[PDB]
A paper describes a structure:
Polymerases generate nascent strands of genetic material by stepwise phosphoryl transfer of nucleotides to primer termini, yielding O3′→P5′ phosphodiester linkages. We reported that 3′-NH2 primer extension can be catalyzed by a modified DNA polymerase, yielding N3′→P5′ phosphoramidate DNA (NP-DNA). The large fragment of DNA polymerase I (BF), cloned from the thermophilic soil bacterium Geobacillus stearothermophilus (Bst), acquires nontrivial levels of N3′→P5′ polymerase activity via two surprisingly minor substitutions: (A) a single active site mutation (F710Y) and (B) substitution of its divalent Mg2+ cofactors with Ca2+ (1). To add evidence that a single divalent metal ion cofactor catalyzes unnatural NP synthesis in BF, a polymerase A family member, we carried out a single nucleotide primer extension reaction in intact crystals.
Conformational changes in both the upstream and downstream nucleotides flanking the nascent bond are linearly correlated with covalent bonding. The downstream conformational change in the dGTP substrate sugar from C2′- to C3′-endo upon product formation, however, was not observed in an equivalent time-resolved experiment with the wild-type enzyme, in which the conformation is stably C3′-endo. Unlike for native phosphodiester catalysis, only a single metal ion cofactor is detectable by crystallography during NP catalysis. The lack of electron density for an A-site metal ion in the ground state and at later time points is also consistent with the expectation of a neutral nucleophile in the NP reaction and the generally weak affinity of aliphatic amines for Ca2+.
Numbering used by the authors: 298 to 876
Write the structure that this text describes.
DNA sequence: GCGATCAGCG
DNA sequence: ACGCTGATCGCA
């Protein structure tokens, strides 16, 4: 029903200087995954190629890697990384429909060509789930069915580039796509393909030691409970805590008693068992998620883990990281932090280098709100999280522990992003009228932040959306909801999204500038990870001193704000040591 | 599959 | 009744 050439060889007219290109990888995780078919649409026609013939053809491989042969694609990072696993370099991607759709409206959740095409009333292509099926029924269809589906996706991309670019231009987002998100896509592909090497001998030794400690704490829990039970059974855990031991019920879930860590900490003065339960869950979390879960995804021949950075998922412009998530590796408790010792350079005599922005969202907020006092604080390089801890806990700077600073950090962000006196009281275990009075004092010191919070909510009501410094956008229809609780969630999104999203814009530009500078200096150093406002690299020992000057400067200069940007950095033998 | 929980980033 | 996430687990 759509005409195309089912090609048995590669011809010259398939290699035009502009084409829509589909390199189809059906498995969710595209690392080392099969490429099941290829479609090309250009001015000369529509073509389907079997991967075994296209990817062994020297003219087609050359065409893929020629940056002056421009390709329009959907999710070009998936294709670029699967091709790297095939030893083939993909260059010249000038349009990525997934990223164009994400910028126009992140809430659409566009996950396939069909969902993006729907945004422009284009429906001559089927959803990928309709073709491959769901779950245990998932399968690559017959070649005639596969070919038409890939050709239809390519024709869709071919037709949709111009109307997507037109709307991007109207939103002031076309340079955001072409100069930020698409260059970042190629850098992430490199980072994902490089992977991070893991010390599996160390990891497995930790897991065995961990398993002994688990049973020890597990027995003490049974003994404190006077009986054995399933510690992870909420119904049995509830019967022990709030029925047998008759502890007060501070919180319910839609399902029953709450047993979250905040509740259990509040119950610590009543019974020693609740702290054993906390230690027990923490150890179990390390065992299940960060020992066993990480060993499951280590590629055995290289001892590398290859995360996937989802670039078109979060509503603020942040990345996310999956299978494994390398953005939530433990750090705060020393027991969990030790897991970072298992993350090691990929070559001997290389080192890990980590650099992160200091108080990034407060500096962005100072700039966007133009609050005189907050701008002055960062022009003085004050540590606002420490200064808030001193105030909260009535201590001196010398006496601020890491824990108090982490707590004050949640107070600072909580307040600027709309925490109530109730939530602040519960978080600080202070009274409610003291919490409300502290919030009032905070906005007396930063009235420009308060004005900003009021203004941004008004602007969202008028426009229907909020934007970031580099013109990312988030629609907030609920901001005019008549339901108070729904409207209130939307208002906090209007306060938070421009700040968190601008911080995401800045680190992304920093990554692009860093990569260009590393190439200009002919360094072997390369990016491994981004963790929202932190960049993690590895490099030969011999490059560390140049990187100590290069990386902070590139990061601090990524944008020019009304206050300085500040970067902290460390390096060491393992990720653990790069702090 | 979903909700609670908890690991991270601000 | 601050925001943005992903993985594991029990299932009230
Ligand atoms: Ca930081």
């Amino acid at each position: 029903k759509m005409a195309f050439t089912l090609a048995d060889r590669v011809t010259e007219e398939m290699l035009a200087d502009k084409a829509a290109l589909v390199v189809e990888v059906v498995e969710e995780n595209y690392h080392d995954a099969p490429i099941v078919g290829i479609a090309v649409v250009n001015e000369h026609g529509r073509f389907f190629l079997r991967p075994e013939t296209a990817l062994a053809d020297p003219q087609f491989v050359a065409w893929l890697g020629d940056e002056t042969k421009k390709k329009s694609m959907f999710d070009s990072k998936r294709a670029a990384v699967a091709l790297k696993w095939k030893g083939i370099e993909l260059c010249g991607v000038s349009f990525d429909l997934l990223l164009a759709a994400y910028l126009l409206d992140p809430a659409q959740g566009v996950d396939d060509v069909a969902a993006a095409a729907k945004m422009k009333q284009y429906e001559a292509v089927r959803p990928d789930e309709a073709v491959y099926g769901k779950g245990a029924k998932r399968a690559v269809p017959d070649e005639p069915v596969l070919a038409e589906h890939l050709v239809r996706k390519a024709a869709a991309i071919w037709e949709l580039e111009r109307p997507f670019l037109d709307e991007l231009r109207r939103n002031e987002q076309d340079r955001l796509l072409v100069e930020l998100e698409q260059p970042l896509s190629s850098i992430l592909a490199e980072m994902e393909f490089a992977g991070v090497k893991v010390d599996t001998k160390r990891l497995e030794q930790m897991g065995k030691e961990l398993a002994e400690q688990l049973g020890t704490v597990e027995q003490r829990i049974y003994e404190l409970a006077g009986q054995e039970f399933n510690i992870n059974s909420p119904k049995q855990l509830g019967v022990i805590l709030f029925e047998k031991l008759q502890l007060p019920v501070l919180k319910k879930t839609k399902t029953g008693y709450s047993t979250s860590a905040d509740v259990l900490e509040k119950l610590a003065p009543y019974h020693e068992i609740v702290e054993n339960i906390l230690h027990y869950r923490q150890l179990g979390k390390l065992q299940s998620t960060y020992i066993e879960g990480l060993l499951k995804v280590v590629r055995p021949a290289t001892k590398k883990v290859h995360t996937i950075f989802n670039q078109a998922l979060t509503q603020t412009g942040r990345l996310s990281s999956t299978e494994p998530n390398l953005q939530n590796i433990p750090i705060r408790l020393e027991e969990g932090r030790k897991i970072r010792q298992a993350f090691v350079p990929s070559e001997s005599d290389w080192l890990i280098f980590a650099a992160d922005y200091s108080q990034i969202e407060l500096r962005v907020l100072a700039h966007i709100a133009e609050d005189d006092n907050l701008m002055e604080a960062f022009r003085r390089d004050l540590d606002i999280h420490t200064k808030t801890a001193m105030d909260i806990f009535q201590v001196s700077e010398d006496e601020v522990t890491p824990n108090m600073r982490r707590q004050a950090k949640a107070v600072n962000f909580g307040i600027v992003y709309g925490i109530s006196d109730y939530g602040l009281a519960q978080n600080l275990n202070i009274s409610r009228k003291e919490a409300a009075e502290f919030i009032e004092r905070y906005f007396e010191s930063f009235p420009g932040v308060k004005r900003y919070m009021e203004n941004i909510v008004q602007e969202a009501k008028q426009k229907g959306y909020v934007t970031t410094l580099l013109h990312r956008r988030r629609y907030l229809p609920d901001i005019t909801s008549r339901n108070f609780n729904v409207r209130s969630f939307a208002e906090r999104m209007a306060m938070n999204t421009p700040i968190q999203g601008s911080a995401a814009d800045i680190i992304k530009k920093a990554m692009i500038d860093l990569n260009a500078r590393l190439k200009e200096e002919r360094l072997q150093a390369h990016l491994l990870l981004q963790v929202h406002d932190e960049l993690i690299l590895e490099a030969p020992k011999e490059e560390m001193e140049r990187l100590c000057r290069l990386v902070p400067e590139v990061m601090e200069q990524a944008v020019t704000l009304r206050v300085p940007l500040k970067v902290d950095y460390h390096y060491g033998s393992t990720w653990y040591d790069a702090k």
